[PDB]
Coordinates of C-alpha atoms and ligand atoms in Angstrom, one line a residue:
Chain P
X166 CA -80.2 -86.8 41.3
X167 CA -78.8 -90.1 42.4
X168 CA -75.3 -90.8 43.7
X169 CA -73.1 -93.6 42.4
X170 CA -69.5 -94.8 42.5
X171 CA -68.7 -93.3 39.1
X172 CA -65.6 -94.1 37.2
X173 CA -64.0 -92.1 34.5
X174 CA -64.7 -93.2 30.9
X175 CA -61.9 -95.6 30.3
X176 CA -61.3 -95.3 26.5
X177 CA -58.2 -93.1 26.7
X178 CA -56.5 -95.7 28.9
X179 CA -57.9 -98.8 27.0
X180 CA -55.8 -97.7 24.0
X181 CA -52.7 -97.9 26.1
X182 CA -53.0 -101.4 27.5
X183 CA -50.6 -104.1 26.2
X184 CA -49.5 -107.5 27.2
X185 CA -45.9 -108.1 28.4
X186 CA -44.4 -111.6 28.6
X187 CA -41.2 -112.9 30.0
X188 CA -40.8 -116.7 29.9
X189 CA -43.9 -118.1 31.5
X190 CA -44.9 -114.8 33.2
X191 CA -47.5 -112.6 31.4
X192 CA -49.0 -109.4 32.8
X193 CA -50.2 -106.0 31.6
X194 CA -48.2 -103.0 30.5
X195 CA -49.0 -99.3 29.9
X196 CA -47.9 -98.1 26.4
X197 CA -47.3 -94.3 26.5
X198 CA -45.4 -92.8 23.6
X199 CA -42.5 -95.2 22.9
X200 CA -42.3 -96.6 26.5
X201 CA -44.1 -99.6 28.0
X202 CA -44.4 -99.5 31.8
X203 CA -45.0 -102.7 33.7
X204 CA -44.2 -104.2 37.1
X205 CA -40.6 -105.4 37.3
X206 CA -41.7 -108.7 38.7
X207 CA -42.4 -109.8 35.2
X208 CA -38.7 -110.8 35.1
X209 CA -38.9 -113.1 38.1
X210 CA -39.2 -116.9 38.0
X211 CA -40.6 -119.4 40.6
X212 CA -37.4 -119.6 42.7
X213 CA -37.0 -115.8 42.4
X214 CA -40.0 -114.9 44.3
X215 CA -38.9 -114.6 47.9
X216 CA -35.7 -112.5 47.5
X217 CA -35.3 -111.5 43.8
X218 CA -32.2 -109.4 42.9
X219 CA -33.9 -107.4 40.2
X220 CA -30.7 -105.7 39.1
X221 CA -29.0 -109.0 38.5
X222 CA -32.1 -110.5 36.8
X223 CA -32.4 -107.5 34.4
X224 CA -28.7 -107.4 33.4
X225 CA -29.1 -111.0 32.0
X226 CA -32.1 -110.1 29.8
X227 CA -31.8 -109.2 26.1
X228 CA -34.4 -107.0 24.4
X229 CA -35.7 -110.0 22.4
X230 CA -36.6 -111.8 25.7
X231 CA -39.5 -109.3 26.2
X232 CA -42.6 -110.2 24.1
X233 CA -44.9 -107.1 24.0
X234 CA -48.1 -107.4 22.1
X235 CA -50.6 -104.6 21.4
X236 CA -53.7 -106.3 20.1
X237 CA -52.2 -108.5 17.4
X238 CA -49.2 -106.2 16.7
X239 CA -45.9 -107.3 18.3
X240 CA -43.9 -104.3 19.6
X241 CA -40.2 -104.6 19.3
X242 CA -38.3 -103.8 22.5
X243 CA -35.2 -101.8 21.7
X244 CA -34.0 -100.9 25.3
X245 CA -35.0 -101.1 28.9
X246 CA -34.4 -99.5 32.3
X247 CA -35.7 -100.1 35.8
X248 CA -37.1 -97.2 37.9
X249 CA -37.8 -98.3 41.4
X250 CA -40.3 -101.2 41.0
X251 CA -41.4 -100.4 37.5
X252 CA -39.7 -101.6 34.3
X253 CA -39.6 -99.2 31.4
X254 CA -39.4 -100.9 28.0
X255 CA -38.3 -98.7 25.1
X256 CA -40.2 -99.9 22.0
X257 CA -39.6 -99.1 18.3
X258 CA -43.0 -97.4 17.8
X259 CA -44.8 -94.6 19.7
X260 CA -48.4 -95.4 20.7
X261 CA -50.6 -93.4 18.3
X262 CA -53.4 -93.5 20.8
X263 CA -51.3 -91.9 23.6
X264 CA -53.6 -89.4 25.5
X265 CA -52.5 -86.2 27.2
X266 CA -51.3 -87.5 30.5
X267 CA -49.2 -87.0 33.6
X268 CA -48.0 -89.1 36.5
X269 CA -49.1 -88.2 40.0
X270 CA -48.5 -89.8 43.4
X271 CA -51.7 -89.6 45.5
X272 CA -52.3 -89.3 49.2
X273 CA -54.5 -91.7 51.3
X274 CA -58.1 -90.8 50.9
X275 CA -57.8 -90.0 47.2
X276 CA -59.9 -91.9 44.7
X277 CA -59.2 -93.1 41.2
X278 CA -60.6 -95.3 38.5
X279 CA -59.1 -98.8 38.0
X280 CA -59.2 -100.4 34.6
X281 CA -58.8 -104.1 35.4
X282 CA -57.0 -105.9 32.6
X283 CA -55.9 -109.4 31.7
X284 CA -53.5 -110.3 28.8
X285 CA -53.5 -106.6 27.7
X286 CA -57.3 -106.6 27.3
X287 CA -59.5 -104.4 29.6
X288 CA -62.2 -106.3 31.4
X289 CA -63.9 -103.7 33.7
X290 CA -63.6 -100.2 35.3
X291 CA -64.5 -99.3 38.8
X292 CA -63.6 -96.7 41.5
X293 CA -61.1 -97.2 44.3
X294 CA -59.8 -95.1 47.2
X295 CA -56.2 -95.3 48.5
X296 CA -56.9 -96.5 52.1
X297 CA -55.1 -95.0 55.1
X298 CA -53.1 -98.2 55.3
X299 CA -51.9 -97.8 51.6
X300 CA -54.0 -100.6 50.2
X301 CA -56.9 -100.5 47.8
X302 CA -60.0 -102.7 48.0
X303 CA -60.2 -103.8 44.4
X304 CA -61.3 -106.8 42.4
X305 CA -58.3 -108.5 40.8
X306 CA -57.4 -112.0 39.7
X307 CA -54.1 -113.5 38.7
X308 CA -52.9 -111.9 35.5
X309 CA -54.2 -108.4 36.5
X310 CA -50.8 -107.1 37.5
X311 CA -49.9 -104.0 35.5
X312 CA -53.5 -102.8 35.5
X313 CA -53.5 -99.0 36.3
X314 CA -55.5 -96.5 38.2
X315 CA -56.2 -93.0 36.9
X316 CA -58.2 -89.8 37.0
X317 CA -59.3 -87.8 34.0
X318 CA -60.2 -84.3 35.3
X319 CA -60.3 -82.2 32.2
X320 CA -59.0 -84.2 29.2
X321 CA -55.7 -85.1 30.8
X322 CA -55.2 -88.6 32.2
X323 CA -53.4 -88.6 35.6
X324 CA -52.0 -92.1 36.2
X325 CA -51.6 -92.7 39.9
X326 CA -51.5 -96.5 40.5
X327 CA -50.1 -99.6 38.9
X328 CA -51.2 -102.9 40.4
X329 CA -48.5 -105.3 41.7
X330 CA -49.9 -107.7 44.3
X331 CA -52.7 -109.1 46.4
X332 CA -52.0 -109.3 50.1
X333 CA -53.2 -112.2 52.4
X334 CA -56.3 -110.3 53.6
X335 CA -57.4 -110.0 49.9
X336 CA -56.6 -106.3 49.5
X337 CA -54.3 -104.9 46.9
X338 CA -51.0 -103.1 46.8
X339 CA -49.1 -101.2 44.0
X340 CA -47.0 -98.3 43.0
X341 CA -47.2 -95.0 41.4
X342 CA -46.0 -94.8 37.8
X343 CA -42.5 -93.9 39.0
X344 CA -42.4 -97.4 40.6
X345 CA -42.6 -96.3 44.3
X346 CA -44.9 -98.5 46.3
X347 CA -47.7 -97.0 48.2
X348 CA -47.1 -98.1 51.8
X349 CA -44.4 -100.2 53.3
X350 CA -44.8 -103.1 50.8
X351 CA -42.1 -104.7 48.7
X352 CA -42.4 -106.7 45.5
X353 CA -41.4 -110.1 46.8
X354 CA -43.2 -113.1 48.2
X355 CA -42.1 -112.7 51.8
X356 CA -44.7 -112.5 54.5
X357 CA -46.4 -109.1 54.4
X358 CA -49.6 -107.8 56.0
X359 CA -51.5 -104.5 55.7
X360 CA -51.7 -102.4 58.8
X361 CA -55.0 -101.8 60.6
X362 CA -57.2 -99.8 58.4
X363 CA -59.2 -96.7 59.4
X364 CA -62.1 -94.8 58.0
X365 CA -61.5 -91.7 55.9
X366 CA -63.4 -89.1 57.9
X367 CA -63.2 -86.2 55.4
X368 CA -64.8 -88.5 52.8
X369 CA -67.6 -89.6 55.1
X370 CA -68.4 -85.9 55.7
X371 CA -68.3 -85.2 52.0
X372 CA -70.8 -88.0 51.3
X373 CA -73.1 -86.7 54.0
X374 CA -73.0 -83.3 52.2
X375 CA -73.9 -85.3 49.0
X376 CA -76.9 -86.8 50.9
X377 CA -78.1 -83.3 51.8
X378 CA -77.6 -82.0 48.3
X379 CA -79.7 -84.8 47.0
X380 CA -82.5 -84.0 49.4
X381 CA -82.0 -86.0 52.6
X382 CA -81.7 -84.3 56.0
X383 CA -82.9 -86.9 58.5
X384 CA -79.5 -87.4 60.1
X385 CA -78.8 -83.8 61.0
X386 CA -79.1 -82.5 64.6
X387 CA -79.2 -79.3 66.5
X388 CA -75.7 -79.7 68.0
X389 CA -72.2 -78.5 67.0
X390 CA -68.8 -79.7 68.2
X391 CA -65.3 -78.4 68.5
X392 CA -62.8 -80.0 66.1
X393 CA -60.9 -81.4 69.1
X394 CA -64.0 -83.0 70.7
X395 CA -65.0 -84.5 67.3
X396 CA -61.6 -86.1 66.9
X397 CA -61.6 -87.5 70.4
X398 CA -64.9 -89.2 69.7
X399 CA -64.3 -90.3 66.1
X400 CA -61.0 -91.9 66.8
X401 CA -62.8 -94.3 69.2
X402 CA -64.5 -95.7 66.1
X403 CA -61.2 -96.0 64.2
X404 CA -61.8 -92.9 62.1
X405 CA -58.9 -90.9 60.8
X406 CA -58.2 -87.5 62.4
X407 CA -59.9 -84.6 60.8
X408 CA -57.5 -81.7 60.3
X409 CA -58.0 -78.0 59.7
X410 CA -57.0 -78.8 56.1
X411 CA -60.0 -81.1 55.8
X412 CA -62.3 -78.5 57.3
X413 CA -61.1 -76.0 54.7
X414 CA -61.6 -78.5 51.9
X415 CA -65.2 -79.0 52.9
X416 CA -65.9 -75.2 52.8
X417 CA -67.5 -75.2 49.3
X418 CA -69.9 -78.0 50.2
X419 CA -70.7 -76.3 53.5
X420 CA -71.4 -73.1 51.6
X421 CA -73.7 -74.9 49.0
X422 CA -75.8 -76.6 51.7
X423 CA -75.8 -74.0 54.5
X424 CA -74.5 -76.6 57.0
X425 CA -71.3 -75.6 58.9
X426 CA -68.6 -78.2 58.8
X427 CA -68.5 -78.6 62.5
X428 CA -72.3 -79.0 62.5
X429 CA -72.0 -81.8 60.0
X430 CA -69.3 -83.3 62.3
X431 CA -71.9 -83.3 65.1
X432 CA -74.2 -85.2 62.8
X433 CA -71.5 -87.8 62.1
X434 CA -70.8 -88.2 65.9
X435 CA -74.5 -89.0 66.4
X436 CA -74.5 -91.4 63.4
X437 CA -71.6 -93.3 64.9
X438 CA -73.4 -93.5 68.3
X439 CA -76.8 -94.5 66.9
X440 CA -76.4 -96.3 63.6
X441 CA -79.0 -95.8 61.0
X442 CA -82.0 -97.4 62.8
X443 CA -83.3 -99.0 59.6
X444 CA -82.7 -96.0 57.4
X445 CA -80.3 -95.6 54.5
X446 CA -78.2 -92.7 53.3
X447 CA -77.8 -92.4 49.5
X448 CA -78.9 -96.0 49.3
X449 CA -76.4 -97.3 51.8
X450 CA -76.8 -98.8 55.3
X451 CA -73.2 -98.0 56.3
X452 CA -71.2 -94.8 56.3
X453 CA -69.4 -94.5 53.0
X454 CA -65.8 -93.2 52.9
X455 CA -64.7 -93.7 49.3
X456 CA -66.1 -90.4 47.9
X457 CA -63.8 -87.3 48.2
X458 CA -65.1 -83.7 48.4
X459 CA -63.9 -83.3 44.9
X460 CA -65.8 -86.4 43.8
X461 CA -69.0 -85.1 45.4
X462 CA -68.7 -81.7 43.5
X463 CA -67.8 -83.6 40.3
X464 CA -71.0 -85.6 40.5
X465 CA -73.7 -83.5 42.2
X466 CA -73.3 -80.2 40.3
Chain L
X94 CA -59.9 -111.7 45.2
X95 CA -62.3 -108.9 45.8
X96 CA -65.8 -108.2 44.5
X97 CA -66.7 -104.8 43.1
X98 CA -69.5 -103.3 41.0
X99 CA -67.6 -103.0 37.6
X100 CA -68.7 -101.4 34.4
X101 CA -67.6 -102.5 31.0
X102 CA -64.7 -100.5 29.5
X103 CA -66.5 -97.7 27.7
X104 CA -64.1 -96.8 24.9
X105 CA -66.1 -98.4 22.2
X106 CA -69.1 -96.2 23.1
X107 CA -67.3 -93.0 23.9
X108 CA -66.4 -92.6 20.2
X109 CA -70.2 -92.6 19.4
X110 CA -71.4 -89.8 21.6
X111 CA -72.4 -86.5 20.0
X112 CA -74.2 -83.3 20.9
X113 CA -77.7 -82.7 19.4
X114 CA -79.2 -79.2 19.6
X115 CA -82.7 -78.1 18.7
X116 CA -83.2 -74.4 19.5
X117 CA -82.5 -74.0 23.2
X118 CA -82.5 -77.7 23.9
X119 CA -79.1 -79.5 23.9
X120 CA -78.7 -83.2 24.8
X121 CA -76.7 -86.2 23.8
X122 CA -77.0 -88.4 20.7
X123 CA -75.6 -91.8 19.7
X124 CA -73.8 -91.7 16.3
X125 CA -73.7 -95.2 14.7
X126 CA -73.1 -95.7 10.9
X127 CA -74.7 -92.6 9.4
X128 CA -77.5 -92.1 11.9
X129 CA -77.7 -90.2 15.2
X130 CA -80.2 -91.5 17.8
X131 CA -81.5 -89.2 20.5
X132 CA -84.6 -88.7 22.6
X133 CA -87.5 -87.2 20.7
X134 CA -88.1 -84.6 23.3
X135 CA -85.2 -82.7 21.9
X136 CA -87.8 -81.2 19.6
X137 CA -89.9 -79.7 22.4
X138 CA -89.8 -76.3 23.9
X139 CA -90.7 -75.8 27.6
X140 CA -94.3 -75.1 26.7
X141 CA -94.4 -78.1 24.3
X142 CA -93.1 -80.4 27.1
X143 CA -96.4 -80.1 29.0
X144 CA -98.5 -81.8 26.3
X145 CA -96.4 -82.4 23.2
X146 CA -97.8 -83.4 19.8
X147 CA -94.7 -85.1 18.6
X148 CA -95.8 -85.9 15.0
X149 CA -96.9 -82.2 14.6
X150 CA -93.7 -80.9 16.1
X151 CA -91.7 -83.2 13.8
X152 CA -93.7 -82.2 10.7
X153 CA -92.9 -78.6 11.4
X154 CA -89.1 -79.3 11.6
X155 CA -86.6 -79.7 8.8
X156 CA -83.1 -81.1 8.5
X157 CA -81.6 -77.6 9.0
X158 CA -83.3 -77.3 12.4
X159 CA -81.0 -80.0 13.9
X160 CA -77.5 -79.0 15.0
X161 CA -75.3 -82.1 15.5
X162 CA -71.7 -81.7 16.9
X163 CA -69.1 -84.5 17.1
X164 CA -66.3 -83.0 19.1
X165 CA -65.5 -79.8 17.2
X166 CA -66.9 -81.1 13.9
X167 CA -70.4 -80.2 12.7
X168 CA -72.3 -83.1 11.1
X169 CA -74.8 -82.2 8.4
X170 CA -78.3 -83.7 8.8
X171 CA -79.7 -85.0 5.6
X172 CA -82.8 -86.7 6.9
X173 CA -84.9 -87.1 10.1
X174 CA -87.5 -89.5 11.3
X175 CA -89.1 -90.7 14.5
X176 CA -89.2 -94.3 15.8
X177 CA -91.4 -94.5 18.9
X178 CA -89.7 -92.1 21.5
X179 CA -86.4 -91.9 19.6
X180 CA -85.4 -89.4 16.9
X181 CA -83.3 -90.7 14.1
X182 CA -81.1 -88.1 12.3
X183 CA -79.5 -89.2 9.1
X184 CA -76.1 -87.5 8.6
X185 CA -73.9 -87.2 5.6
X186 CA -71.0 -89.1 7.1
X187 CA -70.8 -92.6 8.7
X188 CA -69.1 -92.7 12.1
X189 CA -65.7 -94.2 11.4
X190 CA -65.5 -95.2 15.1
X191 CA -68.7 -97.3 14.8
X192 CA -68.2 -100.5 16.8
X193 CA -69.7 -103.8 16.0
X194 CA -73.1 -103.4 17.7
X195 CA -76.7 -104.3 17.9
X196 CA -79.8 -103.0 19.7
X197 CA -81.2 -105.2 22.4
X198 CA -84.0 -104.9 24.9
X199 CA -83.1 -106.1 28.4
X200 CA -85.2 -107.8 31.0
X201 CA -85.8 -106.6 34.5
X202 CA -83.1 -107.9 36.8
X203 CA -80.4 -107.7 34.0
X204 CA -77.5 -105.2 34.4
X205 CA -75.7 -102.9 32.0
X206 CA -73.1 -100.1 32.0
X207 CA -74.2 -96.5 31.8
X208 CA -72.0 -93.9 30.1
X209 CA -73.3 -90.6 31.6
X210 CA -72.6 -87.8 29.1
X211 CA -73.1 -84.0 29.0
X212 CA -72.9 -81.8 25.8
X213 CA -71.9 -84.9 23.9
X214 CA -68.9 -85.5 26.1
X215 CA -68.6 -88.7 28.3
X216 CA -68.4 -87.9 31.9
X217 CA -68.6 -91.1 33.9
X218 CA -69.4 -94.8 33.8
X219 CA -71.2 -97.1 36.3
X220 CA -73.3 -100.3 36.4
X221 CA -77.1 -100.3 36.7
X222 CA -79.7 -103.0 37.0
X223 CA -83.1 -102.7 35.3
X224 CA -85.4 -102.7 38.4
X225 CA -88.5 -104.8 38.5
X226 CA -90.5 -101.6 38.4
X227 CA -88.5 -100.7 35.1
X228 CA -86.6 -97.8 36.6
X229 CA -82.8 -97.6 37.2
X230 CA -81.0 -96.0 40.1
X231 CA -78.5 -93.9 38.2
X232 CA -76.7 -90.6 38.7
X233 CA -77.8 -88.0 36.1
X234 CA -78.1 -84.2 36.0
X235 CA -79.8 -81.9 33.6
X236 CA -78.2 -82.3 30.2
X237 CA -77.7 -86.1 30.6
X238 CA -80.6 -87.1 28.4
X239 CA -79.5 -89.3 25.5
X240 CA -76.8 -91.0 27.6
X241 CA -76.8 -94.7 26.9
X242 CA -76.6 -98.1 28.6
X243 CA -74.9 -101.1 27.1
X244 CA -73.2 -104.5 27.5
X245 CA -70.2 -105.8 25.7
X246 CA -69.9 -109.3 24.4
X247 CA -66.4 -110.0 22.9
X248 CA -66.2 -107.0 20.5
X249 CA -69.9 -106.5 20.0
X250 CA -71.6 -103.6 21.9
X251 CA -75.3 -104.4 22.8
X252 CA -77.0 -101.1 23.3
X253 CA -80.0 -101.4 25.6
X254 CA -80.9 -98.1 27.2
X255 CA -81.2 -94.4 26.3
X256 CA -81.8 -92.0 29.2
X257 CA -84.9 -89.8 28.9
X258 CA -86.1 -88.6 32.3
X259 CA -85.8 -88.4 36.1
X260 CA -88.9 -89.3 38.1
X261 CA -89.9 -87.2 41.2
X262 CA -88.4 -89.8 43.5
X263 CA -84.9 -89.3 41.9
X264 CA -84.8 -92.6 39.9
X265 CA -84.4 -92.7 36.2
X266 CA -86.5 -93.8 33.2
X267 CA -85.6 -94.4 29.5
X268 CA -86.1 -96.4 26.4
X269 CA -84.5 -99.1 24.4
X270 CA -82.7 -97.8 21.3
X271 CA -85.8 -98.6 19.2
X272 CA -87.6 -95.9 21.4
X273 CA -89.8 -98.2 23.5
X274 CA -90.0 -97.1 27.1
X275 CA -89.0 -99.5 29.9
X276 CA -91.9 -99.2 32.3
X277 CA -95.3 -97.4 32.3
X278 CA -93.9 -93.9 31.5
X279 CA -94.4 -91.3 28.9
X280 CA -92.1 -88.6 27.6
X281 CA -94.2 -85.6 28.8
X282 CA -93.5 -83.3 31.7
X283 CA -96.2 -84.6 34.0
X284 CA -96.8 -86.3 37.3
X285 CA -95.5 -89.9 37.0
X286 CA -94.4 -92.4 39.6
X287 CA -92.9 -95.8 39.3
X288 CA -94.6 -98.8 41.0
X289 CA -93.5 -100.1 44.3
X290 CA -90.2 -101.7 43.7
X291 CA -89.3 -105.3 44.6
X292 CA -86.0 -107.0 45.2
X293 CA -84.3 -109.1 42.5
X294 CA -84.2 -112.4 44.3
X295 CA -81.9 -114.3 41.9
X296 CA -79.4 -111.5 42.1
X297 CA -79.4 -111.4 45.9
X298 CA -78.6 -115.2 45.8
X299 CA -75.9 -114.6 43.2
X300 CA -74.3 -112.0 45.5
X301 CA -74.5 -114.4 48.5
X302 CA -72.6 -116.9 46.3
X303 CA -70.0 -114.2 45.5
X304 CA -69.7 -113.6 49.3
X305 CA -68.9 -117.3 49.8
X306 CA -66.4 -117.4 47.0
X307 CA -64.7 -114.5 48.8
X308 CA -64.6 -116.1 52.3
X309 CA -67.8 -114.6 53.7
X310 CA -69.7 -117.6 55.1
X311 CA -71.3 -116.8 58.4
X312 CA -74.7 -116.8 56.8
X313 CA -74.5 -120.5 55.7
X314 CA -76.6 -123.0 57.7
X315 CA -77.5 -126.7 57.7
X316 CA -81.1 -126.2 56.4
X317 CA -82.9 -126.4 53.1
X318 CA -86.3 -125.4 51.8
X319 CA -88.4 -125.5 48.6
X320 CA -89.7 -122.8 46.2
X321 CA -93.2 -122.7 47.6
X322 CA -92.1 -122.1 51.2
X323 CA -89.4 -119.6 50.1
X324 CA -91.6 -117.8 47.5
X325 CA -94.1 -117.4 50.3
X326 CA -91.6 -115.5 52.4
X327 CA -90.3 -113.8 49.3
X328 CA -93.8 -112.4 48.8
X329 CA -94.0 -111.1 52.4
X330 CA -90.8 -109.1 52.0
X331 CA -91.4 -107.7 48.5
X332 CA -88.9 -110.1 46.8
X333 CA -89.5 -111.3 43.3
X334 CA -90.7 -114.9 42.9
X335 CA -87.8 -117.4 42.4
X336 CA -88.4 -119.6 39.4
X337 CA -86.9 -122.9 38.3
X338 CA -85.0 -121.0 35.6
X339 CA -83.4 -118.9 38.3
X340 CA -82.3 -122.1 40.2
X341 CA -80.9 -123.4 36.9
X342 CA -78.9 -120.2 36.3
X343 CA -77.4 -120.3 39.8
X344 CA -76.4 -124.0 39.1
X345 CA -72.7 -123.2 38.5
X346 CA -72.4 -121.3 41.8
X347 CA -74.2 -124.0 43.8
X348 CA -71.7 -126.6 42.5
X349 CA -68.6 -124.4 43.0
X350 CA -69.5 -123.8 46.6
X351 CA -71.4 -126.8 48.0
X352 CA -74.4 -124.7 48.9
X353 CA -77.7 -125.7 47.2
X354 CA -79.9 -122.8 46.1
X355 CA -82.7 -123.8 48.4
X356 CA -80.0 -124.3 51.0
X357 CA -78.9 -120.7 50.2
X358 CA -82.6 -119.6 50.0
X359 CA -82.7 -121.0 53.6
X360 CA -79.8 -118.8 54.3
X361 CA -81.6 -115.9 52.6
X362 CA -84.9 -117.0 54.2
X363 CA -83.1 -116.6 57.6
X364 CA -81.6 -113.2 56.8
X365 CA -85.0 -111.7 55.7
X366 CA -86.5 -112.0 59.2
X367 CA -83.6 -111.7 61.6
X368 CA -81.5 -109.6 59.3
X369 CA -78.5 -107.2 59.4
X370 CA -78.9 -104.3 61.9
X371 CA -75.2 -103.4 61.3
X372 CA -73.5 -106.7 60.4
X373 CA -72.1 -107.1 56.9
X374 CA -71.7 -109.3 53.8
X375 CA -69.1 -108.3 51.3
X376 CA -68.8 -104.9 53.1
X377 CA -72.6 -104.2 52.8
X378 CA -75.1 -103.8 55.6
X379 CA -78.0 -104.6 53.3
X380 CA -78.8 -107.4 50.8
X381 CA -77.4 -106.3 47.4
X382 CA -79.5 -107.2 44.4
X383 CA -77.8 -105.5 41.4
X384 CA -75.3 -108.3 40.6
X385 CA -76.5 -111.0 38.2
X386 CA -75.2 -114.6 38.3
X387 CA -73.2 -113.8 35.2
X388 CA -71.8 -110.6 36.7
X389 CA -70.6 -112.8 39.5
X390 CA -69.1 -115.5 37.2
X391 CA -67.8 -113.0 34.7
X392 CA -66.0 -111.1 37.5
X393 CA -64.9 -114.1 39.5
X394 CA -63.3 -115.7 36.4
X395 CA -61.5 -112.7 34.7
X396 CA -63.4 -112.4 31.4
Ligands
YSG774 C1 -47.4 -110.3 49.8 C2 -47.8 -111.7 49.2 C3 -47.9 -111.5 47.7 O1 -46.7 -111.5 47.1 C4 -46.6 -111.2 45.7 C5 -45.4 -110.6 45.3 C6 -45.2 -110.2 44.0 CL1 -43.7 -109.5 43.5 C7 -46.2 -110.5 43.1 C8 -47.4 -111.2 43.5 C9 -48.4 -111.4 42.4 C10 -48.1 -111.9 41.1 C11 -49.0 -112.1 40.2 C12 -48.7 -112.7 38.8 C13 -47.7 -113.7 38.7 N1 -47.3 -114.2 37.5 C14 -48.0 -113.8 36.4 O2 -47.6 -114.4 35.2 N2 -48.9 -112.9 36.5 C15 -49.3 -112.3 37.6 O3 -50.3 -111.4 37.6 C16 -50.4 -111.9 40.5 N3 -50.7 -111.4 41.7 C17 -52.1 -111.1 41.9 C18 -53.1 -112.1 42.1 C19 -54.4 -111.7 42.3 C20 -54.7 -110.4 42.3 N4 -53.8 -109.5 42.2 C21 -52.5 -109.8 41.9 C22 -49.8 -111.2 42.6 O4 -50.2 -110.7 43.9 C23 -47.6 -111.5 44.8

């Protein structure tokens, strides 16, 4: 029993974190086999921030300009290449702690663990969801760039996020490990703002199923809804559309609890109308949308 | 920017988790140096659980009765002993992944990271506070006994919690690594309930400071109070008394903010009657009390 934002054990990723320095700029890199991945803005300077030409900046660098440190060991850079917004530094030694891993690009609504790091040294681990507006709501200070997000279903680490920047509203933007940004963001200091965010409806429903699994039914009701009528109401609260895909994905949790998906949708409609009237659900006084259906199944059974 | 509940990186502890099997019972052990620590109820059968005689159950057992698995490697037990509610299994090999560590006993209101494990394999990590009623609000299923809680200071792991049981209300109870229970609980399958919980006042204030540091300021006001007046309202709402040591600990945040504790208690005083009813601080509709002042400083400074 209990239900918590539960991160993956971070050890497999801790052994991959290194420090990358160019001039006065130091951030984190990810050391997998004989490659170190880091944000390409490690090669910018102060006057480079608004409109850096990364191709022109990189061509002027020699390998010895990159100082890569793994704990106390200095890693020798023997080559480099830029892929989208990620720099790939070939180093002269393969990381002996490299886990089984893959790179995946996730969709909005998916969750992952963030290993926040400074100077190549991990400081904390926590869960994040990719918001519908392609930001994440993390906790990052200066020097955290190059921290990564990952899942570890099975014993394979799936890297899905590398942290690049904090936007004006305090939320965070980054890339996949192929260097493609999530969302419309670019790695330069020009004015950028996240779009209006919305609530991840399928995740709220998954969390309500988690509440039922854990023994709480107070928010259910005797009503059902059509998928169309549910979406018409939920969008008035800035909720994301619920698709037939989402309804299919919730099938297993519906089966375990005996509550049809569209019956849980009717519960959510009433919760948006009424609020919680002094009650909580799984310890929260708001509707939680950063647990996926997969997360609920991972944690509840 | 941002403020999140963050656990310590768990790698130093992952390398210490093993599986301990006694008959049909399998749970998790902590392998440090050449000893494996686990809950003593691993030696009970279902019928023993109702009213166990642990020193008699332990007398009946021998080294060969304990099956200890580290990954795919079997560890040989060469000795066994009990310390309070923890079993100590001497093995023939020192864990080469043993971190610098010590055993500590934490105080209510203090936080730690939990590494939830099943069959000796780490499964998830999250932060917990030791509640005033000596429970923790974790997330644990059958097979999680022997999972541990810990803090990290530089390179030294301070182990503070070993998981033993889930109470009827769904909250969790355990021991320190010397086998002493937190709270008025016993390791027997019997009706037990934690006392009425209370809210950790100094942590709520710490979290209000975190909210200010992050631009959330609508709860600030011009007023101030004193301990006696606040503690009087704290009592009414089931909040822990606020001591002078608490005010001292929040000193740094009062400075770096311009809000005096009793000024903030006046803020908190106000929130306790009028309240939330929907509105939010740091994205929460309720007053969060599982962040310590150091959690706030540690996180809002990059340590
Ligand atoms: C849209 C407006 C923001 O524009 C950009 C654009 C770009 Cl390309 C980078 C950055 C940025 C750089 C650094 C950084 C610089 N120099 C270093 O030595 N180490 C660093 O880490 C850090 N953080 C940051 C701060 C707090 C939390 N998370 C990330 C950043 O956002 C911001």
